[PDB]
Design a protein around this ligand. Structure first.
Ligand code: CNC
Ligand code: CNC
Lengths: 231, 230
C-alpha cells in the first residue's frame, strides 16, 4: 500500500579519483556526438554530448572536488562532493546539447525530484565575475542588487506522445529585493508538478544576455539523488 | 474508420511565383529558426532563414521555374505541385535540419508524401550546372562511369528522441547501367516509421569534397504529406 522511493545512484561507477564518465559510442550531430547514459538500475536515461572541448553537454557523472578553478575545464560542483556520496551529475543544457532525463518505466514509476547545486564554473562567474575565459570576459560582471540579477533552472515535463505537462523553476542565484543568494549547498528541487513526465528537459535563463538574447552566464548545473516513486 | 488526412498549403500564397517568408524566427548562429504549422494544425515544419533568404528546413512555394540554375530558384523540376500549385521545398543539413512534427501522434500515424527534385538539383545532376558561375562546386554531371546516386533518408523518432528507423528514396541513380534522375512526383512511403512523433531528413551522394561533405545541393521537394487515423 505504502509507495516505495527509488534513488538513482552512480556511486562506485568511476574507477579513478577526480574523474568523469567518458565514451566514444556517440552518433555525430552538427557539433557534438550524442549518447544516452542508462543508470546502473536501468530506471532512467540521461542525454550525453561530447566534442572538441571534451564534455559538450547533456549530463555526465563525476567525483571531482575542485571548488577553486574557474572556467569550463572544471566540471566540479561548488559543494566539492555529492549529496549522497562521491559521485554526482554535471550538466550543460542549451540548444546544441539539450539535457534530457527519460523515465524507462513510466507506467510503474513517477518522478519525485532531485538535489541541485551550482557548478564551480557558475559559482565563480556569479560571485567573482570570473568565468575563466581569460583576457576576454563573456559575462557582464558579478551579479548585483543594482541589476536585480538572477539565474533560473527550468524543468519541463512531457508525456510519451510529446504533450507538454508543465514547467517548474529553481533559482540558482537571486539578487532581487536586496537578497544576495548564490546556491552553494545541495538543495531539494521538487518535481511533483511534473511527476507523470515520460521525459524532462532542462533550460537555463538569467539577467546577463547578449544582444541576440543568448545567456552569457554558463548554462551549467549539478544534480544528485534523482528520486522516483512507485505509482 | 481508417481515414487519411492530406496536408495542404493550397491557396496559402496571395501572389504567383512566391514563397512563404517570416520575420518571426529566433536567432541561432547563422540562421533564424521558426516552426510552420499547416492550416489544419496537424503538422509542424522546421523553417530557417538568413543572409541568402531561405536557409533550410521547409518553405511552401508555387514557383514554376524549370530553367534557372542555382540556389536563388526554389522551384520543383515539375514546375507545379502534385495536388495543385503549392508544394514544399526543403534544404536539409546540419545547420538547418528539415523536421516534420506530428502534432497529434496519439490520434494519427504517418503514411507518406510525394517527392521530387528541385530545379537546382536537377540541372546540377543532368547538366553539371549548379549556377555557382565561374566557380563550380560539383564534380560534373552524374554518370554510369562513377556509379553516381543521390539519396534522401527519412529518420523516424519517438517524442523522447529514440530512433525508430530510417527509409531511403533515390532522387538519382546511375548504378548498374540505370540513368534515373527524378523529374516527376513519386510516392515516398513512410509505413516503416508510421509511429514517429517526428521525422528528420538527411541527404547523401557520390559527389563529396575532400572532407566528405556533399557537393550535390542538399535540397528536395515534397507534396501531399499524408497522415492516417490509428
Ligand atoms: C555558437 C556558440 C556559442 N557559445 Co559556446 C556554447 N554553447 N559554442 C558555440 C559554438 C561555436 C561555433 C558554431 N558552430 O557556431 C560551439 C557549439 C562550437 C561552442 C562551443 C563552446 N561553447 C562553450 C561554452 C561553455 C559557452 N559558449 C557560449 C560562449 C556560447 C554563445 C552564447 C553567448 N552568450 O555568447 C554562443 C551560443 C554564441 C556565440 C556567438 O556566435 N557570438 C557572436 C559572435 C559574433 O562573437 P564571437 O566573439 O566571434 O563568437 C565566438 C565565441 O563565442 C566562440 N566560442 C563559443 N563558445 C565559446 C566558449 C568559450 C569558453 C570561448 C573562449 C569561446 C567560445 O565561438 C564564436 C565564433 O568563433 C556560452 C556563453 C554559452 C552559455 N553557456 O551561456 C559559454 C561560455 C560561458 C562563459 N561565460 O564562460 C563550450 C565550453 C561548450 C562545451 N563544448 O562544453 C565550448 C567551448 C569552445 C571553446 N572555444 O573553448
Ligand atoms: C560551411 C558552409 C558550407 N556550405 Co553553404 C551551406 N549549407 N554555407 C556554409 C556556411 C559558410 C560559413 C562561412 N565560413 O562563410 C554558411 C552556412 C554561411 C553557408 C551558406 C550557404 N550555403 C548554401 C548552399 C546551398 C551550399 N553550401 C555548400 C557550399 C556548403 C559546404 C559543403 C561543400 N560540400 O562544400 C559547407 C558545409 C562547407 C564549406 C567549407 O568550409 N569548405 C570549403 C572550403 C575549404 O573552401 P572555400 O571555397 O573557402 O569555402 C567557402 C564556400 O564553401 C562558401 N560558401 C558556402 N556555401 C556556399 C554556397 C555558394 C552558392 C557559394 C558561391 C559559396 C558558399 O563559404 C566558405 C567560406 O567562405 C553546399 C555544397 C552544401 C550542399 N550540399 O547543399 C551548397 C552549394 C550547392 C551547389 N553545388 O551549388 C546556401 C545557399 C544555403 C542557404 N542559406 O540556403 C548559402 C549560400 C552562401 C553564399 N555565399 O551564397
Amino acid at each position: 500500500d505504502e509507495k516505495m522511493e527509488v534513488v538513482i545512484s552512480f556511486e562506485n561507477q568511476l574507477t579513478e579519483a577526480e574523474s568523469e564518465f567518458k565514451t566514444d559510442l556517440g552518433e555525430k550531430g552538427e557539433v557534438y556526438f550524442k549518447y544516452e547514459i542508462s543508470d546502473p538500475q536501468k530506471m532512467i536515461q540521461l542525454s550525453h554530448y561530447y566534442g572538441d572541448w571534451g564534455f559538450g553537454g547533456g549530463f555526465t557523472y563525476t567525483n571531482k572536488t575542485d571548488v577553486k578553478t574557474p572556467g569550463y575545464s572544471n566540471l566540479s560542483a561548488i559543494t566539492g562532493k555529492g549529496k549522497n556520496g562521491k559521485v554526482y551529475l554535471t550538466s550543460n543544457t542549451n540548444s546544441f546539447t539539450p539535457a534530457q532525463i527519460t523515465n524507462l518505466n513510466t507506467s510503474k514509476y513517477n518522478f519525485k525530484g532531485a538535489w541541485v547545486t551550482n557548478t564551480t564554473y557558475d559559482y565563480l562567474a556569479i560571485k567573482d565575475g570570473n568565468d575563466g575565459a581569460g583576457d576576454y570576459s563573456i559575462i557582464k560582471g558579478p551579479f548585483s542588487n543594482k541589476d536585480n540579477d538572477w539565474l533560473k533552472l527550468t524543468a519541463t515535463g512531457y508525456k510519451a506522445d510529446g504533450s507538454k505537462i508543465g514547467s517548474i523553476d529553481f533559482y540558482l542565484a537571486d539578487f532581487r529585493n536586496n537578497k544576495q543568494e548564490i546556491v552553494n549547498t545541495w538543495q531539494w528541487f521538487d518535481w511533483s508538478g511534473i511527476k507523470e513526465a515520460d521525459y524532462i528537459t532542462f533550460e537555463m535563463s538569467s539577467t546577463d544576455n547578449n544582444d541576440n538574447g543568448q545567456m552569457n552566464t554558463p548554462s551549467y548545473f549539478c544534480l544528485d539523488g534523482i528520486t522516483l516513486i512507485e505509482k
